[PDB]
Amino acid sequence: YTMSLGAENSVAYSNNSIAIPTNFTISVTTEILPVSMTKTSVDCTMYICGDSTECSNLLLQYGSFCTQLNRALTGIAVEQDKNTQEVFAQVKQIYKTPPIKDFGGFNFSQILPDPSKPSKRSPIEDLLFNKVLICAQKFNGLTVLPPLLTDEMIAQYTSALLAGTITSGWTFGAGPALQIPFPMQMAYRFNGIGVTQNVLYENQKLIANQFNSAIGKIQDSLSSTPSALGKLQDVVNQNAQALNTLVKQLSSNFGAISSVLNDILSRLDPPEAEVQIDRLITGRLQSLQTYVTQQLIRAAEIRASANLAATKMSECVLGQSKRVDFCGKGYHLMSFPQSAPHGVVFLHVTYVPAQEKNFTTAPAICHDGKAHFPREGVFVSNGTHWFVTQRNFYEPQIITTDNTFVSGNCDVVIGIVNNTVYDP
Amino acid sequence: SALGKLQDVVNQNAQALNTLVKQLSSNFGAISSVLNDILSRLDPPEAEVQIDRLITGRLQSLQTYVTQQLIRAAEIRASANLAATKMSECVLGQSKRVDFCGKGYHLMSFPQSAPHGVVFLHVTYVPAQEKNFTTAPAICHDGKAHFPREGVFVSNGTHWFVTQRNFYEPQIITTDNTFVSGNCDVVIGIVNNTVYDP
Amino acid sequence: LTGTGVLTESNKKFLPFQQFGRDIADTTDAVRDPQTLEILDITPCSFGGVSVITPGTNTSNQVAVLYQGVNCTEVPNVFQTRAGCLIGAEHVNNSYECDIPIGAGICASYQQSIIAYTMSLGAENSVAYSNNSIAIPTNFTISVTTEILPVSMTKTSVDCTMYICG
Ligand SMILES: *[C@@H]1O[C@H](CO)[C@@H](O[C@@H]2O[C@H](CO)[C@@H](O)[C@H](O)[C@H]2NC(C)=O)[C@H](O)[C@H]1NC(C)=O
Ligand SMILES: *[C@@H]1O[C@H](CO)[C@@H](O[C@@H]2O[C@H](CO)[C@@H](O)[C@H](O)[C@H]2NC(C)=O)[C@H](O)[C@H]1NC(C)=O
Ligand SMILES: *[C@@H]1O[C@H](CO)[C@@H](O[C@@H]2O[C@H](CO)[C@@H](O)[C@H](O)[C@H]2NC(C)=O)[C@H](O)[C@H]1NC(C)=O
Ligand SMILES: *[C@@H]1O[C@H](CO)[C@@H](O[C@@H]2O[C@H](CO)[C@@H](O)[C@H](O)[C@H]2NC(C)=O)[C@H](O)[C@H]1NC(C)=O
Ligand SMILES: *[C@@H]1O[C@H](CO)[C@@H](O[C@@H]2O[C@H](CO)[C@@H](O)[C@H](O)[C@H]2NC(C)=O)[C@H](O)[C@H]1NC(C)=O
Ligand SMILES: *[C@@H]1O[C@H](CO)[C@@H](O[C@@H]2O[C@H](CO)[C@@H](O)[C@H](O)[C@H]2NC(C)=O)[C@H](O)[C@H]1NC(C)=O
Ligand SMILES: *[C@@H]1O[C@H](CO)[C@@H](O[C@@H]2O[C@H](CO)[C@@H](O)[C@H](O)[C@H]2NC(C)=O)[C@H](O)[C@H]1NC(C)=O
Ligand SMILES: *[C@@H]1O[C@H](CO)[C@@H](O)[C@H](O)[C@H]1NC(C)=O
Ligand SMILES: *[C@@H]1O[C@H](CO)[C@@H](O)[C@H](O)[C@H]1NC(C)=O
Ligand SMILES: *[C@@H]1O[C@H](CO)[C@@H](O)[C@H](O)[C@H]1NC(C)=O
Ligand SMILES: *[C@@H]1O[C@H](CO)[C@@H](O)[C@H](O)[C@H]1NC(C)=O
Numbered sequence: 001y002t003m004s005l006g007a008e009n010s011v012a013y014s015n016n017s018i019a020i021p022t023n024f025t026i027s028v029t030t031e032i033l034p035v036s037m038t039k040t041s042v043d044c045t046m047y048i049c050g051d052s053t054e055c056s057n058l059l060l061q062y063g064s065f066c067t068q069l070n071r072a073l074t075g076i077a078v079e080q081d082k083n084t085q086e087v088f089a090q091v092k093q094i095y096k097t098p099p100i101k102d103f104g105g106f107n108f109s110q111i112l113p114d115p116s117k118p119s120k121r122s123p124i125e126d127l128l129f130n131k132v133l134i135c136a137q138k139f140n141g142l143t144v145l146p147p148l149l150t151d152e153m154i155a156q157y158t159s160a161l162l163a164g165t166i167t168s169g170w171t172f173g174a175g176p177a178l179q180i181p182f183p184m185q186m187a188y189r190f191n192g193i194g195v196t197q198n199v200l201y202e203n204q205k206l207i208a209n210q211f212n213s214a215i216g217k218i219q220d221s222l223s224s225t226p227s228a229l230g231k232l233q234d235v236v237n238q239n240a241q242a243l244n245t246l247v248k249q250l251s252s253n254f255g256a257i258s259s260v261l262n263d264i265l266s267r268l269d270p271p272e273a274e275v276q277i278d279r280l281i282t283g284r285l286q287s288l289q290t291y292v293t294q295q296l297i298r299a300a301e302i303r304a305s306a307n308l309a310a311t312k313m314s315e316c317v318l319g320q321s322k323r324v325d326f327c328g329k330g331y332h333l334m335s336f337p338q339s340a341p342h343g344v345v346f347l348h349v350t351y352v353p354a355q356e357k358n359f360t361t362a363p364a365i366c367h368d369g370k371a372h373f374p375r376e377g378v379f380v381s382n383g384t385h386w387f388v389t390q391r392n393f394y395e396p397q398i399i400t401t402d403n404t405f406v407s408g409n410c411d412v413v414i415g416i417v418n419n420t421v422y423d424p
Numbered sequence: 425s426a427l428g429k430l431q432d433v434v435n436q437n438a439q440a441l442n443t444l445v446k447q448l449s450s451n452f453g454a455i456s457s458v459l460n461d462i463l464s465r466l467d468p469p470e471a472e473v474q475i476d477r478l479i480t481g482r483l484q485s486l487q488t489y490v491t492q493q494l495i496r497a498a499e500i501r502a503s504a505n506l507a508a509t510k511m512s513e514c515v516l517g518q519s520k521r522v523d524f525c526g527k528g529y530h531l532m533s534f535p536q537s538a539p540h541g542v543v544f545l546h547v548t549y550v551p552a553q554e555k556n557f558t559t560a561p562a563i564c565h566d567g568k569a570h571f572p573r574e575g576v577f578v579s580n581g582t583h584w585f586v587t588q589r590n591f592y593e594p595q596i597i598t599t600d601n602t603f604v605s606g607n608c609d610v611v612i613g614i615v616n617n618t619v620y621d622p
Numbered sequence: 623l624t625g626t627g628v629l630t631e632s633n634k635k636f637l638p639f640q641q642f643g644r645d646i647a648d649t650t651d652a653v654r655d656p657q658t659l660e661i662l663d664i665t666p667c668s669f670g671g672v673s674v675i676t677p678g679t680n681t682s683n684q685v686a687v688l689y690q691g692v693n694c695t696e697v698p699n700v701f702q703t704r705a706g707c708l709i710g711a712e713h714v715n716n717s718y719e720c721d722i723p724i725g726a727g728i729c730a731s732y733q734q735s736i737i738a739y740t741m742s743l744g745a746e747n748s749v750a751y752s753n754n755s756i757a758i759p760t761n762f763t764i765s766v767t768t769e770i771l772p773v774s775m776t777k778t779s780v781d782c783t784m785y786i787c788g
């Protein structure tokens with residue numbers, strides 16, 4: 001079929017009608033980013049000329065090719081450790097939550113560690129690790145270096161970042177962590193997105209329930225959907241295929257009488273053996289150069305992803321972002337990092353407008369001949385009475401001189417309406 | 425070792441050039457690495473074979489060099505794009521992006537020229553001395569719920585004040601720095617106090 | 623069939639006609655002995671990278687050696703870690719900040735002799751969280767942080783005919 005680009009929605013635009021949300025939902029969006037790549041390493045002489053003095057001596061006629069290949073792979077491994085360090089080691093101190101997790105109704109048990117098991121990971125992190133040969137590869141001079149930061153250390157970093165975010169808001173990212181009650185921190189985040197504090201406090205129980213439910217939805221989504229962590233699995237698969245391809249190239253003859261170097265040396269004397277070995281060296285060297293080039297390009301892609309993940313860690317977790325769609329879909333409130341195999345998962349908590357209502361609007365109100373404009377919100381009408389309300393949440397208030405300002409007269413503003421401004 | 429980021433780039437390019445030049449001393453299976461010696465000693469039927477071996481090895485070395493330079497150049501391009509972004513957002517403005525323009529709350533930045541690079545001196549505001557205070561989300565005065573307009577409500581243990589969030593500066597709580605929404609029965613943690621109306 | 627390796631008794635169920643075996647890598651990993659019909663597994667002789675851990679020559683000429691992915695019983699202050707067998711570094715129970723990375727959470731430093739330790743991720747700080755307590759700064763400092771970024775690379779050029787066929 002011809003694909004659809006989405007449902008059509010004609011917006012009911014007019015010069016005097018504004019829609020304003022009367023309710024909202026708390027949404028948690030999952031973003032998965034690769035951070036690191038498996039740190040492979042290949043001994044160029046072992047791969048090309050394993051246990052053979054004659055081949056190694058012939059290989060010396062190609063100069064420094066093996067040295068620069070080993071250097072390139074070493075540089076990749078170092079880069080992977082740097083990528084992990086830049087994404088996760090962004091907190092100076094290891095923060096811990098208090099024993100009594102009273103956060104004003106907000107439940108964080110799904111994202112905080114649960115020490116009942118030997119590895120102090122959270123349940124969501126356990127899901128990520130559970131969702132997402134070595135001898136056969138290793139035997140040809142292809143070793144794998146362990147990451148500098150172990151899974152337990154990544155979990156400890158995410159735990160520290162999360163404890164800081166919950167108990168200190170964004171203050172731990174700019175200097176010394178300052179303790180704050182979590183509803184007050186949420187009040188600051190609501191102010192950040194342009195919603196007043198009383199909206200949060202009056203609806204604190206509803207907001208806490210919506211948050212806890214959304215986290216549960218994330219738990220179920222990860223538990224159910226098999227292809228959710230495809231971004232990390234694809235990286236693992238690409239590296240596994242690259243190693244399998246490199247190893248399989250050793251079975252190629254490349255025009256030689258045999259792919260096995262030992263059989264050539266067992267059967268032939270140097271005047272013929274050198275020709276057969278040169279053919280094997282040329283093919284194996286070309287295969288190794290192809291592998292290294294692919295790893296450098298893939299590593300550059302991983303580096304770009306890791307830089308993005310580090311940027312999101314700084315701007316979405318250690319602060320509150322005003323960049324649209326950078327920290328999830330909606331108005332960003334806060335984010336929580338989670339460790340994942342070779343990567344990071346961000347749970348972005350966003351404010352999303354829900355229920356819709358039409359209202360009549362005007363750019364200004366004409367009271368005594370002076371033009372009154374709203375200081376913080378907009379002027380709305382329900383069809384009979386005029387009120388002033390904050391832009392992102394319908395909360396009508398009587399229009400007074402304390403929430404409006406005066407500039408000019410009624411003859412200049414197009415669309416100004418007549419009404420009464422009260423002066424308590 | 426402070427300027428290691430720039431020195432590493434200089435070293436990588438120097439090593440790449442030294443490696444490329446050193447590849448000319450390799451025989452690649454030829455009788456000699458020196459093209460002039462082959463042409464001085466051999467006639468075309470044998471010289472072409474020896475030269476083809478040298479061409480294959482030198483061409484492979486040059487292709488390897490160019491590929492490494494393209495990948496390194498892409499990395500430098502990414503760094504330069506980041507530097508240009510920081511120049512625009514940290515020097516020609518004030519950023520609200522956490523840790524983008526230094527560690528702390530960004531105030532301003534100053535660029536400095538460096539060999540093959542740029543150094544930014546980021547001037548940030550960092551909170552220093554700490555003090556504990558008792559807080560409340562709202563104050564109940566006449567049965568109405570008062571919320572702070574710009575700061576938070578704090579107490580030193582006996583008196584309640586309103587202060588800006590990032591610097592302790594207690595002020596008397598008045599109707600000019602608070603707003604009223606709803607009543608005292610909805611806000612969890614509301615405390616009783618007096619709001620003055622000058 | 624010739625090669626170098628370690629011969630062990632195999633638990634593979636070879637069929638009566640099979641004379642040797644191969645791994646996932648398509649390399650020989652098992653052989654049937656031509657005199658007694660025993661199945662042997664062939665593993666390569668132990669190998670791995672050798673890395674030298676060192677403080678600079680301005681401070682000391684003492685070094686430590688990491689045998690990457692090798693057991694400490696095969697190589698001949700010997701510390702076996704996940705990264706490999708580290709010889710010459712004294713293992714301590716005191717954690718510190720990472721200086722020279724070894725791998726798998728292990729770092730090394732020169733403090734005199736070279737020591738190895740599990741790296742610290744930072745000092746612990748339990749935040750005094752409660753439902754009615756807020757900390758607010760009463761003073762501040764002005765900090766200048768230095769960030770260094772590469773902008774350009776040396777503009778080299780090579781004449782391909784001059785380089786190859788001067
Ligand atoms: C705002 O939306 C929430 C849901 O996002 C509403 O809460 C639901 O209210 C209905 C009442 O009809 C209950 O049956 C549901 O169980 C509630 N769900 C939750 C999660 O609380 C809330 O009532 C809405 N408020 C307004 C003023 O419209
Ligand atoms: C915080 O959330 C967890 C799970 O998200 C809650 O634990 C569940 O509690 C119910 C009790 O009604 C049990 O039936 C579930 O089996 C529990 N699940 C798990 C995974 O433990 C926990 O009770 C919540 N805490 C609070 C204070 O509400
Ligand atoms: C627009 O809002 C005003 C304010 O609530 C409404 O006026 C009230 O209407 C109810 C009817 O249910 C009366 O009981 C109140 O006494 C009215 N208050 C005042 C101050 O007049 C008005 O009805 C709304 N108009 C529409 C079309 O919804
Ligand atoms: C808002 O109110 C003013 C009066 O306060 C209206 O001005 C009147 O306009 C008509 C039409 O031109 C004149 O005949 C009247 O003489 C005007 N009144 C006065 C006192 O001069 C104005 O039209 C109103 N605007 C709207 C949109 O209703
Ligand atoms: C909280 O702040 C108030 C305001 O400064 C303090 O009240 C003052 O205390 C001093 C004692 O050194 C008296 O000399 C002043 O006359 C008091 N002023 C008023 C208006 O009462 C109060 O002592 C502080 N409380 C604590 C526990 O520090
Ligand atoms: C804040 O002040 C109100 C009174 O202004 C307190 O309400 C009293 O609560 C007790 C316990 O339920 C009742 O016995 C009194 O009759 C209430 N007073 C009135 C005038 O009705 C309220 O408890 C205070 N809150 C705090 C936290 O101190
Ligand atoms: C705020 O901090 C500054 C330093 O960051 C303080 O200035 C110092 O004050 C002490 C007084 O004991 C002097 O000995 C130092 O020489 C001062 N240093 C500088 C750089 O000025 C300042 O006093 C602090 N202010 C408050 C109110 O605590
Ligand atoms: C607003 O009015 C339009 C009619 O132009 C209607 O289509 C739309 O559904 C209305 N919105 C609400 C929330 O009632
Ligand atoms: C708004 O649009 C309507 C047409 O739907 C028009 O009649 C009216 O004059 C417009 N109002 C203003 C202030 O332009
Ligand atoms: C605040 O109180 C806690 C006690 O829970 C204490 O550990 C901390 O040092 C206090 N902070 C200051 C700045 O006095
Ligand atoms: C705040 O926490 C304490 C426990 O330390 C509790 O006694 C008190 O009732 C709580 N206050 C509110 C408003 O929940």
Ligand SMILES: *[C@@H]1O[C@H](CO)[C@@H](O)[C@H](O)[C@H]1NC(C)=O
Nearest residue numbers: 638654655656657658659660
């Ligand atoms: C010689 O090889 C045959 C092969 O079947 C085997 O049966 C026999 O036992 C072998 N003899 C000795 C002395 O190894």
Ligand SMILES: *[C@@H]1O[C@H](CO)[C@@H](O)[C@H](O)[C@H]1NC(C)=O
Nearest residue numbers: 425677678679680681682732
């Ligand atoms: C390095 O060694 C020189 C002596 O050759 C000495 O002057 C200098 O202070 C040393 N620097 C450090 C950092 O140890």
Ligand SMILES: *[C@@H]1O[C@H](CO)[C@@H](O)[C@H](O)[C@H]1NC(C)=O
Nearest residue numbers: 692693694695696702703704
């Ligand atoms: C090294 O060999 C010993 C056997 O003596 C074994 O117990 C140990 O687990 C081995 N360690 C590793 C890392 O293979």
Ligand SMILES: *[C@@H]1O[C@H](CO)[C@@H](O)[C@H](O)[C@H]1NC(C)=O
Nearest residue numbers: 701712713714715716738739
């Ligand atoms: C660390 O402490 C334990 C005691 O729990 C001890 O058995 C072990 O030998 C110590 N390790 C080192 C390297 O001193």
